[PDB]
Structure 1
Amino acid sequence: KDAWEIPRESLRLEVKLGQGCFGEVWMGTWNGTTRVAIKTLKPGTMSPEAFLQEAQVMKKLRHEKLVQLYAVVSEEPIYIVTEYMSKGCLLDFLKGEMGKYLRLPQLVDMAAQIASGMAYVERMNYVHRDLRAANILVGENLVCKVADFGLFPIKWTAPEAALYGRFTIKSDVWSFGILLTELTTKGRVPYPGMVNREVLDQVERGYRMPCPPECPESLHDLMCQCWRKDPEERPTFEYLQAFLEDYFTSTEPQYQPGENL
């Protein structure tokens, strides 16, 4: 009914990108010229108004470092259409062919951009709740955009969230820090060796991950401020961004290209 709507002759479903739970994800072309990502609803495997809740958010939330909602088709079969990202999600990108070649400069930059997005989310008074490498999209020239693929991620979750349901932007700052390890370890699931329950008692007993192999120390300090027990001591995203944008000038101007970072 609104300005976002387009005919289905414009939509060229070309290559599939996995069957979700309540539909499929598609790589394709809109208006025969624009590389596009299409999300499907399998009719009557979910409330229509539930499936369109997505686009209603993506309309509200617009920023260079966020997913772009392109277009909707809001009559069965229903199609949500969003800007295509050539590299797919960050997690894949990290532990795939390219991981080999990424260093701290490329990694902190990706991280800078995420913060940038997540900072707009701050200014929006919205919470994410599942910020983490699986939820970031990469495209050309290492562009990173915040997203949510619709995917119990306790390992990434702040204890006030995992425990008492107390979900804030500060609990998103906890995730960021975890994400900072995903980036510094090229994909490796945080708290290796630990089963969930184990993690949960452990960070309550105050345990944090060590600085990973060859990651500088000021990157870890930064991580730790994200993992402060008290939710309100954690840095603002505005802070984090700045910190990371200025990193190799203001913090590691003495940084030397390593074996893995």
Structure 2
Amino acid sequence: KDAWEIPRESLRLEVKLGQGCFGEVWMGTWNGTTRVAIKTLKPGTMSPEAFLQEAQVMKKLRHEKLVQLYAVVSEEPIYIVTEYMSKGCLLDFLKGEMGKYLRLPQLVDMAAQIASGMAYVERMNYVHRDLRAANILVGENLVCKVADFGLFPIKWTAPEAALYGRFTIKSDVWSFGILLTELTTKGRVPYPGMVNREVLDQVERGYRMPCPPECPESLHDLMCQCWRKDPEERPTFEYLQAFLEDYFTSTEPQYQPGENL
């Protein structure tokens, strides 16, 4: 065994956080005083090999804005242990009590962190496949990090990805565009009123969501750039990041606080 492997009694599973039928996720403590999130396998549901294929991927991906692997126990019972992101998922964070105080400058900063996480994925030649607010984790002081809860999200998926299976970093770009509409509507589901097949049909014909209320036209323009038909036309995460980091100087220097944004 290797560097990640830790003894089982060095963990304390304190609070149940979530359960699917492939296992559980707990908030916990590792050795002394180290808050951790601990993921569990429900025995019988998937291959011990296949469950630990997740931490096999997280060992090779290290960056400030992707959730970080801490430890691995690799005989049953097995556990994957990461840093604790204390405020939960970005979708819940936008919708809940705390979603009503977020204004355009906190939201654009959030998008810039995620672009940064995604710029690193982009430089690593990796592909997310499921970039959306449900898979972004939030910590203290509005820190965001890219994650994957490992669950059909046609509403967040590019036409070439949904129809023909061509998932690339260019399809994660399209979803980032969709993630942007999530931030600007406080977590609302994209294409309001529309069902999957009506979405898949309207979009092929050239439909793209309109500027959300109070959101600046220049930010809708970036979503629209992320939603080009031709995957290669779509911008780079290095571009998306720098454009969001620089936003209130280069692009909307006369921005003024509103009711929701």
TM-score category by the smaller chain? over 0.9
Name the CA distance, whole Å, in 2 between partners of 1:22 and 1:102. Answer: 34
Per-residue deviation, 1:33: 0.7
Per-residue deviation at 1:32? Answer: 2.8
Q: How far 1:87 moved relative to its partner?
A: 0.6
C-alpha distance in 2 between matches for 1:213 and 1:42:
44
Distance in 2, matches of 1:35 and 1:137, equals: 15
TM-score, with length taken from structure 2: 0.99
Give the TM-score, by structure 1 length.
Answer: 0.99
CA offsets 1:138-195 (integer angstroms, 9 cap, x no match): 0000000000001200000000000000111000100000000000000000000000
Contact 1:107 1:184 in 2 (8 A): yes
Alignment match, 1:184: 184
Partners of 1:210 and 1:42 in 2: CA distance = 43
1:44 is displaced (CA, Å) by 2.2
SS in 1 for 2:192: coil
Is the CA contact (8 Å cut-off) linking 1:40 and 1:79 kept in structure 2? Answer: yes
Partner of 1:244: 244
Q: Measure the CA separation in 2 of the matches of 1:2 and 1:21.
A: 29
Give the Cα–Cα distance (whole angstroms) in 1 for the partners of residues 93 and 201 of structure 2. 31
Q: Tell me, yes or no, if structure 1 residue 134 matches structure 2 residue 134.
A: yes
Q: State the 1:43 CA deviation.
A: 2.0
Deviations 1:18-57 (A, max 9, x none): 2122111101100131000000012222110100010000
Superimposed CA distance per residue, residues 199-257 of structure 1 (whole angstroms, 9 cap, x where no aligned partner): 00100010010000100010000000000000000000000000000000000000000
After superposition, the CA RMSD in angstroms is 0.6
* Greater shift in the superposed pair: 17-26 or 200-209: 17-26
CA distance, structure 2, for counterparts of residue 93 and residue 151 of structure 1: 19
Distance 1:135 1:187 in 2: 12
Q: Structure 1: how far apart are the matches of 2:80 and 2:69?
A: 8
Identity of aligned residues (%): 100
Counterpart CA distance in 2 for 1:106 and 1:124 is: 28
1:182–1:190 Cα contact (<8 Å) kept? yes
For residue 8 of structure 1, report the CA deviation from its aligned partner: 1.1
Give the number of aligned pairs.
261
In 2, are the aligned partners of 1:42 and 1:77 still within 8 Å (CA)? no
Q: What is the SS of the residue equivalent to 1:70?
A: strand
* Deviation larger for 37-46 or 187-196: 37-46
Matches of 1:42 and 1:127 in 2, distance apart?
Answer: 27
For structure 1, the 5+ residue unaligned runs are none
Q: Distance in 2 between matches of 1:245 and 1:87?
A: 23
